[PDB]
Symmetry: C4
Subunit: 164 residues, 4 copies
């Protein structure tokens, strides 16, 4: 992680300030300060990986998937004849903790921190689907966005979407 | 937002420090810290939108409009015969809150914070003209700057300016 | 000022922290914060003006001029015969406050803060020569650096230098 | 130092904050602040030298040298007949304090701060070899990495490595 000298000075000063404000953790700060001041490249790389990225459009796709399930569930709940469509199929199961952790994390963030989609059933494992779901959701979105309405959907439309 | 990782580290450290200094708002800072650390692109873009821009020359134009009204009002008050020029026409009415908010904001900043043009009549709504004025003011400035003097204006000159 | 939005966020956070640490000056910090957040271009430019530049080589030239006077004064005081050479001529008078302020400021910094050349006679006005001296000093340096020794100068050499 | 003005403002604000937090050292900070604000180039360059660099791959090489000595020492201890093979030769002596200070410092950091290779014999001088070792270690690594096993080495292999 490079990282101009001027930035190193700024960071160095921060670790000094953090030591002043929070001496309980001086060890932690002096260590980082040393890494930054001396330009220990290995440890600097390792710092660099504390920082992730989840692209805007990916964030939006996740939110849209949740919105799709909102549209599906409401639509289902207003069907005269729930044409033997199981509620589970119209319920957002979330993402796989093992392979889709970034995505799962974002859902949890959107719900627990931001406060969105709070009336969703989290399931038994806080939206951990336990199977990969990303590819499925993409295909569902495609069918959903292709419908002439997205909300108040017919049983037919619901089935096309959930079976994508 | 196009942050480098070094900048993300700096910001992250700030939110930690702000939590130390102001624990009442730990929630607010922990959230921003998460957004920055994890690189949640959607949330980062929304961070970017909090920062506006009002170009130097636009700032100066606004100040100049106010200065023009100063020149106009002073000129008028020193007219031997105020040739039926209503004071209202020689009074800075400000900007439209609905479509010219940035401009209105700057006027208020220049007056209330900076302390300039304190003796101006703010009107009943703190310089909310309630109609767009920007285009009018530009035409007035053109006539005003074209006068061979800008101050101690003749009634004739005053009329040309206010009728631009 | 050409700030990126990330930098504006960093600065904004600093002004919030400075308000926490030093509430006596909340108004000053609050005002800067507004300027930065809203991107008020005029005020941002005026912010830029707070920051000067004095190039490395200019800094070094000033220090060297002082060192030259050290060499001159020691040389003079060690002379069996000071050939009617006035001590004043071998004394660093400093710089013109009115036209050479940057230079005068640096001398004062080097002496009062850094602690260098503290045995120099500051004169009655803290190294303010109150005539411009920069061009003279340049010519003196040229003669001085051209001398085969720079120290333990002969009366002859001293005269060539001070008369440059 | 190649600081932008925005960075200078950030740094200047830090030194203000550090003075608030730690007034005992106001002098230290006021001085740096002056250097930064006024752009005193000489002193600004001297700041830069406070920051060092030790490339990632060099950091890794040092760690690998230590790991090599771990592999060597364990292998030797497990030897049923140490065709002895003085233990001294299979012990990491460190780096020369006088010419390999950057390296020596990194070892000390990895051991004392990070907590790695804590069972290593530090010798009488905390890994100061007092002779240059860098070139030797490189040749040893070359032989070591060329062995089909890196660990559980034969006495033969140990000798090839230590004699590289
Ligand atoms: Mg790694
Ligand atoms: Mg949000
Ligand atoms: Mg938006
Ligand atoms: Mg203009
Ligand atoms: Mg101003
Ligand atoms: Mg110095
Ligand atoms: Mg030097
Ligand atoms: Mg490590």
């Amino acid at each position: 992680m490079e990282m101009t000298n001027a930035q190193r000075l700024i960071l160095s000063n921060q670790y000094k300030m953090m030591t002043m404000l929070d001496p309980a953790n001086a060890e932690r700060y002096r260590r980082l300060q040393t890494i930054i001041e001396r330009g220990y490249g290995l440890q600097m790389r390792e710092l660099d990986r504390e920082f992730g990225e989840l692209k805007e459009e990916t964030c939006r796709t996740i939110i849209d998937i949740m919105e799709m399930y909102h549209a599906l569930h409401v639509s289902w709940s207003n069907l005269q004849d729930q044409q033997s469509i199981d509620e589970r199929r119209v319920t957002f199961l979330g993402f796989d903790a093992a392979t889709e952790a970034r995505y799962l994390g974002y859902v949890r963030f959107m719900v627990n921190v931001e406060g969105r989609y709070t009336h969703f059933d989290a399931g038994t494992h806080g939206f951990n689907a336990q199977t990969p779901m990303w590819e499925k959701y993409q295909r569902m979105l495609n069918v959903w966005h292709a419908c002439p309405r997205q909300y108040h959907l017919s049983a037919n439309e619901i089935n096309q979407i959930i079976n994508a």
